[PDB]
Amino acid sequence: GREFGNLARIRHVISYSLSPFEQRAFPSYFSKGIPNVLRRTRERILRVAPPFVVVYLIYTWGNQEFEQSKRKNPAMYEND
Amino acid sequence: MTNMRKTHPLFKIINHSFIDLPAPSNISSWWNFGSLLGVCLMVQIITGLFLAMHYTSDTMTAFSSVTHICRDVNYGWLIRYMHANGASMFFICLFLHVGRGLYYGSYTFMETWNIGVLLLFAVMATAFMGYVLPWGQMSFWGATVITNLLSAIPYIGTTLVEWIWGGFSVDKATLTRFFAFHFILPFIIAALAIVHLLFLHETGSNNPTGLNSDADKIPFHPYYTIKDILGILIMFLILMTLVLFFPDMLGDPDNYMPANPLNTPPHIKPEWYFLFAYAILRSIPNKLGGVLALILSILILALMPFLHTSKQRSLMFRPITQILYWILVANLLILTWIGGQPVEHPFIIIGQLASISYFSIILILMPISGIIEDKMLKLY
Amino acid sequence: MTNMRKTHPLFKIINHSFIDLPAPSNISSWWNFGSLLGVCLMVQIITGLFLAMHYTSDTMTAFSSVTHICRDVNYGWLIRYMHANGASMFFICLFLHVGRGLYYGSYTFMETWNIGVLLLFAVMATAFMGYVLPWGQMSFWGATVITNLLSAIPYIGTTLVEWIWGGFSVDKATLTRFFAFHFILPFIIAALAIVHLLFLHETGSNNPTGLNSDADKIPFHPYYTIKDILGILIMFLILMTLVLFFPDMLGDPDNYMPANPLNTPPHIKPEWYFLFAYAILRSIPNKLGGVLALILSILILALMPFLHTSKQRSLMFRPITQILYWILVANLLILTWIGGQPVEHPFIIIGQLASISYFSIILILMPISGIIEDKMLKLY
Amino acid sequence: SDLELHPPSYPWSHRGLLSSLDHTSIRRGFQVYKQVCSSCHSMDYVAYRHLVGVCYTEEEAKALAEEVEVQDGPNDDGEMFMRPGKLSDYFPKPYPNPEAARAANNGALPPDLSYIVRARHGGEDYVFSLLTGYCEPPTGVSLREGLYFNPYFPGQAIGMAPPIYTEVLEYDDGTPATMSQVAKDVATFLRWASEPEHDHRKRMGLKMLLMMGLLLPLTYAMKRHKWSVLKSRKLAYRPPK
Amino acid sequence: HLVGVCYTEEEAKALAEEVEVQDGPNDDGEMFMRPGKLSDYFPKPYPNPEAARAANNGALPPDLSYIVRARHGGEDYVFSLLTGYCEPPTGVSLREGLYFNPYFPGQAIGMAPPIYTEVLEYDDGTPATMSQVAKDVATFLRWA
Amino acid sequence: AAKNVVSQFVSSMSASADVLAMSKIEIKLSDIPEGKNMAFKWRGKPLFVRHRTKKEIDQEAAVEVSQLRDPQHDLDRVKKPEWVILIGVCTHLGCVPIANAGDFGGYYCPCHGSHYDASGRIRKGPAPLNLEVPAYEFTSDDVVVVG
């Protein structure tokens, strides 16, 4: 019922493609991969990173608070 | 002549579901993960079958049979640690699959989503009983704790717990029936996954833009065939570097001791993928409150399609709800960390705040944010 | 609009398979039997699952666990004897289903017939290893005998038998892997039954006249719904009287002793549904020839669609081939009787003549009879 | 005290990612277990045939197995009898049942050391720190008979007397048997006892890393072939205006 | 298992308490004898089958828990075996420790005739003939 | 990779290390004195070994093949007639034969009285068949490898 031939109505659209044996599999891989990755990470880093930053701060604070919770209070054994 | 691929009644279903299936051209690597889950299921089943040819479900001999598998069966340690780390890989791929479904608005496929949350419940039950199966110290005490908190239901809870146990406590009958149930449930999971694929294939897949991708669809073969093969290879790389190099970084050492009913461990945990729910279960000082908190913490995914108040399906063009989503992932990681911690200061107040924030972000903050985002685009 | 039974994607499969399926009006009670098989399969699975809740696959405690099921588990004797007599009922229904397919020309549905032959092989293997599972005297000695006949294969047979054994003889590893395989094979049988129904619903079903029943077809619901429920209720009458009144008329008494490798029984037999194949194998005075005789007996049952040399499909209007068919069924009864007898006079010559007549009736006499009938009816 | 002291990280010869065990150290640690640790601790899941091809030859392990006496039976009169041990025999029990261990060790149960570096946090570092960490208790805390102070044991009151000192045994290869050397050897032996597949696992991991380093860029290249037919596709909209 | 079938609770408890069974280990790991309980199984006469073979002239007396279901004829076979001890016919030479029983396969059983007339005294005053005792023990074996 | 995975799983389905350890016996050696048979345990079965004299060899070889209950000479039962190795299970009801008893001077079963000779043949008794001889191997004379 839902196969190729009856998916959508498309008019006046031209597509050009070439054979995979005709073109390279890695056309300028590093020289255009690096700026594209940098663009994607600079468009998403402010939405993604600060929650995990404050997870790191909460994790370190909780671990150190537990460590000083196990620490001996020097105020005890001071009266006698 | 006759095209055999489109006419043979067994090859027609295989064609329509894997070869000539019209898939969106722009789906990212996250859409690999569900196929990985299926592969993981098969891997688990295969490894489970090769654990079943030597495992004995007797409390006198279960630990001895597991050690015999690890020490005397040829490459039996390999199959056992592949089974354990494949359960861990199953839950990693399951969590990322659910996160993809939450982020890209795929829950509007409501029947597929509900069959999914049924599959998630079945997989969690299977993994729990499987972890009980080696009959270590940790297995026995985890089963005892989970069933004891399951006894919190009024007027039927003690009877139901003694019915599940087959006795006064966790004993030989519990281990044998857990072996039977852990054997039989992954085939029900496979059948439910077939229903899951059918309910997806009535309407096609979603794309990361969330738009109607009918203008740009490609056949599943060879594009997503080779993409799924590459994802399978990467998942196998991570699974074998988990098995062959760090085989005990995810398990607990106390499971290598035999089950002592007289000796209790100083700190009782489930395995890591349950841990966040355990934190929610101990964020309320009431037994029924914690039990219902765990049940609604899993069932809030089923409640999720009724909370969508935005005119855009995906979160690609929705930055405020993106921020709320990553805060949700953040305090899910926080609840996972709290669930492995003992119950003292400040873990109690951190877990309580994390559970409150989890339920308030899913229930309250995301629909209000979607209303605000619709107001910003002059739509509301 | 609201015709959910034919618009819901899950519900339309059940509709198309069981409610609005066009079935011939004139099919007799023989066409009930396959449906009974599916129900009987479900019964086996259910009883087996509860039998898996208390059984241990350890050679020191398998017999002890069977006695503990029969004595201490509430209605555990009922579950065990329903499982054993349901295996017997399953093979009765298989024999009548295969006989219907042979008589009424249903083998011309070739894919359905071949998937059936694979199903029959899987069910026979499952029942063999399940009979090995209680670890009585006859279980151990029948497993040893059948694996020795497997070791009759030249140049690869001995290594294959020690690979299947997991050692030097039938032992702990054999019993545990037989429990694993006996658990896992009925789900593959259920999937192959789904493929069976898929091919049959692709081609439609046959009627006792062998004619095109497209002119007179009725919905499956409620006619064959109430007819198969009547058949299920009759089958449950026979199964429950076999369980509650004569529990040991089909079983063997020597399986109620523990397995002793030192003591051999005076006469070793398999169960009654393997006795005709045992008599076929035992008649030829050779090992490899007897194993090939058993395999090629079930394989000429598979080869039956290539021997049909008649212009009519069913045997309703073919009296000579009817006589040959009833002689064949009579010969199968004789072979089943001989398989339970020891090797003295005149059982060797009776079994030899029975097997020779069996292969001669299937391979030679039936197509010659069909050609004679085509001459007598002035077809050509 | 409820406060715990974590053992430090020691530079083990098997600590590295592909670093196997030193088998001479496993042989020396087996000698340490046989002469010292076998009097109280058990090794129920380790047999003598596991030592063949790891620390000893077939005849050396056969002699080691036949040095001890194993209960066996039943005889033709139905009675138990002692016999010399063989390669299929497991390591002998110190006690017939754990209650005899409780009676002989002042109420304490010496655990089975077959998974003792797998069942403890720290692994062989914890075993080395426990064996080489016996010291005098500080002021304020006092301990009774049958108890010994050990800061690495949880609760700091272990029921095990210090079993290792300088020259507690004589090695076969003439190695000086100091306390640190004997503890390092027995920790290596216990690491092997918990993980007998360790060297084979690391060899498999090395082959896996080499095979994945070969196969990942090649499968990536095949994917980018079959997808670079699409990733250079160009579109054009030509409405008739 | 005898409660609610043949005996009451106190009767079966007295039956259990009149025999001494094996218990252990204690706090110092030593086996010791104790009075029997209701959950205790019926005591084995021998600790191992080799001791049974040594005591019973090579032959092993089988466990009679399924001896009705593991023999052809059921309790008819047991009743015919217990009441069917007869003198051997001519031409049959019989060794020591063996007894002629035509219902036994091979007609040479290693079991001496275990029941006779007044072989025990019944609690209910039933006369203990050989046939009555054999019928009672065959009924008990069918129940077992 | 697929070869190694399939081969490892198939080898996992094969015999384990403890089964392979229990299959081979320790060295029987030449501890057997003249006339006496001794019994070891092998695969849950008794195993009798005995030194044999030439007069007993000829006395067992005087009995023909086809005239017995089962056709088997003395020459094909053993490779070297100096030693006799057999499985010590009576094949009637699984009992143990008594060493140096019976009318033939071989073995006797106290269960139901089956007379066995020095070669393990049945001649008088209800035993349906003989006592089976395992397939052993002859190394240098200090070691015989059976199993």
Ligand code: HEC
């Ligand atoms: C008898 C005097 C023993 C000798 C010889 C050895 N051990 Fe022991 N050990 C003994 C006891 C009574 C206990 C339990 C004490 C308690 O309070 O629980 C132990 C314990 C250990 C442990 C476990 C430590 C833990 O955290 O549970 C280890 C790892 C251990 N012992 C090591 C060990 C080694 C390597 C030995 C040979 C040198 C050895 N022990 C000898 C009693 C005795």
Ligand code: HEC
């Ligand atoms: C010691 C003298 C015994 C007494 C008291 C009882 N039985 Fe026995 N029994 C004994 C032996 C040594 C054997 C095996 C002998 C042999 O030739 O195999 C048996 C055997 C039986 C059997 C099994 C018969 C069979 O066909 O296998 C039965 C059913 C049996 N005995 C019954 C039985 C009953 C009911 C007894 C109480 C009256 C009884 N026996 C006492 C030794 C002894």
Ligand code: HEM
């Ligand atoms: C039908 C297929 C399966 C079978 C037959 C099976 C069988 C077994 C057996 C026998 C064990 C005990 C051996 C051991 O200790 O590892 C086991 C353990 C386990 N199984 Fe499965 N299993 C199956 C599928 C799964 C699946 C799908 C999961 C994941 C949800 C799973 C999760 C586990 C876990 C976590 C353990 C504990 C491993 C450990 O000891 O650490 N199993 N399984």
Ligand code: HEM
């Ligand atoms: C048992 C584990 C699971 C398996 C094997 C599984 C299998 C699959 C497969 C094969 C697909 C199609 C490929 C893809 O889009 O990734 C898919 C898609 C999907 N699954 Fe699952 N799934 C599982 C768990 C879940 C769960 C728990 C949910 C619910 C949260 C879920 C909801 C979905 C949705 C919504 C899609 C559609 C993806 C889209 O179009 O965006 N699945 N699943």
Ligand code: HEM
């Ligand atoms: C997956 C479902 C099944 C499971 C879990 C299962 C499990 C078991 C178990 C545990 C036993 C041993 C208990 C006993 O001896 O009665 C057993 C026995 C047996 N099973 Fe199954 N079984 C299953 C399906 C089947 C099927 C489909 C057949 C064939 C019709 C079958 C034939 C048998 C037979 C013949 C026995 C021996 C009965 C006896 O002698 O006591 N089983 N099964």
Ligand code: HEM
């Ligand atoms: C595993 C057991 C089996 C099950 C559950 C099964 C199931 C079924 C079902 C539900 C039907 C349709 C209803 C009917 O006509 O009776 C059917 C028909 C059929 N089956 Fe099977 N079957 C089994 C075994 C076999 C075998 C062993 C064969 C091959 C000899 C076979 C060949 C056929 C054929 C030819 C039909 C068509 C009947 C006709 O239209 O005349 N089946 N089966």
Ligand code: FES
């Ligand atoms: S058992 Fe040996 S003579 Fe019968």
